[PDB]
Amino acid sequence: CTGNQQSLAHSRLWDAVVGFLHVFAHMMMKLAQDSSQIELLKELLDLQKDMVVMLLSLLEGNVVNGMIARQMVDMLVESSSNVEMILKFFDMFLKLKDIVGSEAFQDYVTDPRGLISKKDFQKAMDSQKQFTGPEIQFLLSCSEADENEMINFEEFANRFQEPARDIGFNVAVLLTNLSEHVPHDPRLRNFLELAESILEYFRPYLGRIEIMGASRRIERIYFEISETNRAQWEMPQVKESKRQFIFDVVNEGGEAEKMELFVSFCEDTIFEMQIAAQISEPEFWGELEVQRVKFLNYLSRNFYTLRFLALFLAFAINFILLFYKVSDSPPGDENMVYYFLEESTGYMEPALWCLSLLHTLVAFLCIIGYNCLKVPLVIFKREKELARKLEFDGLYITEQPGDDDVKGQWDRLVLNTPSFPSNYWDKFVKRKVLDKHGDIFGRERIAELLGMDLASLEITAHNERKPDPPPGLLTWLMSIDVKYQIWKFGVIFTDNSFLYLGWYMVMSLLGHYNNFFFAAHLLDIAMGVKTLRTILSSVTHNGKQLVMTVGLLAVVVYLYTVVAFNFFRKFYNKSEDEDEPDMKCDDMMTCYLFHMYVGVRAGGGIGDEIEDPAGDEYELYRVVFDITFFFFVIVILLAIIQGLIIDAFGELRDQQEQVKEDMETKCFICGIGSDYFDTTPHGFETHTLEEHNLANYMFFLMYLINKDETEHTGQESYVWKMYQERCWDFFPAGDCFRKQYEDQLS
Amino acid sequence: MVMSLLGHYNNFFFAAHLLDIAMGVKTLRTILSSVTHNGKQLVMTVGLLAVVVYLYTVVAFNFFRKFYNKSEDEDEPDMKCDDMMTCYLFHMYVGVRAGGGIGDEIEDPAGDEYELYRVVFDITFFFFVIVILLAIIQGLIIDAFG
Amino acid sequence: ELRDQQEQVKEDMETKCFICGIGSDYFDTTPHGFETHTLEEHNLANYM
Ligand SMILES: [Zn+2]
Ligand SMILES: [Zn+2]
């Protein structure tokens, strides 16, 4: 709201702000000891939080050299030596909070059974890092005596932590906004170098997102980044997924539609981080339940090492199995038996049995882990796709599928259970589609189709029927939603990785009959690595053309057989003299089999095993036939196969080079090339790392998912409404806050 | 130095110093670097050859035993596919040096059952092994040059 | 040569207006400018 801000700017508020800040500073500096005013300090922390929220909301987004910015600047200038001691107190308390339990603190240990003393604490603090005279004097004054024995460091460091962190982050955001708004102001500069620790402490927790909306203006909005979210970005899994997404968008994806894919990737990565956070180390019926939950958590935590151990066991079993020998007399016909040739020790069959049982156990462990880990992601993907197809499209409402996609019918036949959005966040999807398609179609038909209950209960409440029956025993008879479980089984069995793992399971189970089927598990794990995936993908990239070329080989060899059947019959003689039943070109099928059997394995055509054409007529016809067969068949077929595979390699390398070059020369989010950001040194490096660092948008979206609308700001509410509407106009697109606003005013 | 010193015993070790200086020139460095540019992929492809030939040996051990006879008549101890290790060695020894698959040295499948199974086995072995392996090696080296 | 020709023709169709001689850089001042330029002003099939 511009009018309210303009009216409030011309008011006698800055003096009140200065008075409040001075009063608060003297509150902390005087009334902090005696350990009897915790409630007062909590109240002042809350009041300071509300005050800085008011200041931030008053500032918001504006012109880079606006009047409100100058007013705020002179308010800070008049507030010199009024917030400095507050910042110093916050910095020293944060230092105390982080130092306790960091280094040599579990190694120093004055009292193994008791606590530290005042002199001991002073000596430790002097021996520590970043401690000054007046600061340690004030800390000793604020340190409670408790007879120099009951100094509980654990209860002292965690005393005022969350409000202090919130105030520090908010004041850091405010100072960063003031620094970024005015380009050059020496007063704010020299006010800033004195207070640098409180700014550097919150350096990696300050986001930056640029929006084009809000009356066609560009402003930077700030937010908080959780520590767990920052620590979850260093896993190679997420980086590999991001690289795969970027490659898919650049190569396979088109234009003017990338941003929906970006939002989908952000949502998927948010769900992945939520699953990873849930699957963590900290995590008689109740004991059994918690033991089962802990076991499943441990199993889902370790999944990639289990596949490696399975591969190792497969190699070990295969190496052990390279000892068989077929014998007639069994030492321990149609009675040939298979036995190990050990010749050194008899501890071979027990080793094989133990390794087989261990391999089976690892196989069951990994299939249970896959069922417990990756299935929710696919379920959430399907639910999100159904929500998108039902809300903004009439695939199951306006029109109908044309009986061509079985997945469409299967996804349609789930709209009958109350527990439909099990994992999708926006539970208000049925209400949303009812409100959207409420006037054009009857409400009763929509409720019947979606399985919604009576609309009388929804429109008018009763506030009198709130039952709560006791659980007792056997509460799982109603917990099954039959239809939802059937749909889940269908979608989990139509998948690919689960089908492959099930094939692995059944092949191992069939191999438990002491056979080579364990040795048949080799390539299926040998192709499940990262660095052979590229080679196998290059081979299978031209999947159809190779099959077509093989069919062309079959057609050409067949036509050659037909044209050589009724002209050349006595030449084919694959035997010696005095043998009448030895022709291999009498039957058409046998002649075709012989021509294929030779022309696929050659290098001398067919003339290396057939009677030489002597002076018995048809000499020139036979030789021109054979030489043209050689040339056409062998040269064309081998050359096309080689050309297809070489072209596959070249196409793969070209795609990789193109995607790397495009990522190196454009901003992806913004449409400006790498030429406009060369006016300043390292301009493009800072442009894609500070303004819109790609990963910053995901952090902002995850922050926006939390912090419900009861506490949203204007910008947050606008962004949430825009995201719910799914129109994607708040993205920077053309301008990137460097032009127009900073083109002239800098 | 140490190879020359060991070669001072009047042997061929002096003649073993040839390639080590033959690859220390400027204009062969580019060709040798192009060959060794895809160092890991060639080793992986060789390992894939070993895996595929091993699986073919396993699937051909318990189905085709009387066909392998690398001798003449009136000779009982001449099977080269009885032992698993010997059969694997024979399949590697043939499938790495071929051009006629394995059918240039093994008894022809006559009308004694398993004729179609044996022929489809042999032709798919030829196609997969030889075509895939040679094509991947050629593709790797051409891609290195490019 | 075949792959190069296909890539070149696709890239040229993706970066020029064919009918007009202006490149795909002048229609970036507004969001989705080039998408609307070849779909509304001269959609090629409109001339037929
Ligand atoms: Zn940009
Ligand atoms: Zn045009």
Describe, in plain words, how this protein is organized in 3D.
Chain C: ATP binds at residues 13-18, 38-44. Chain C: This is Ryanodine receptor 1. The structure is cut from a larger assembly and holds three copies of chain A. Chain A has 746 residues and is mostly helical. Helix content of chain A is 60%, strand content 2%. Chain A is built from 35 helices and six strands. In chain A, the strands form three sheets. Chain A has a two-stranded antiparallel sheet. In chain A, strands 3-4 form a two-stranded antiparallel ribbon. Chain A has a two-stranded antiparallel ribbon with strand order 5-6. In chain A, strand 1 (209-211) and strand 2 form a beta hairpin. Chain A starts with a helix and ends with a helix. Chain A binds chain B through residues 318, 321-326, 341, 516, 519-520, 522-523, 526, 531-532, 535, 538-539, 550, 574, 593, 596-597, 600-603, 641-642, 645-646, 648-650, 653, and chain B through 40-41, 44-45, 48, 51-52, 54-55, 58-59, 61-62, 65, 82-85, 88, 99-101, 103-104, 108, 119, 123, 126-127, 131-132, 135-136, 138-140, 142-143, 146. Bound molecules: zinc ion (2 copies). One zinc ion binds next to strand 6 of chain A.
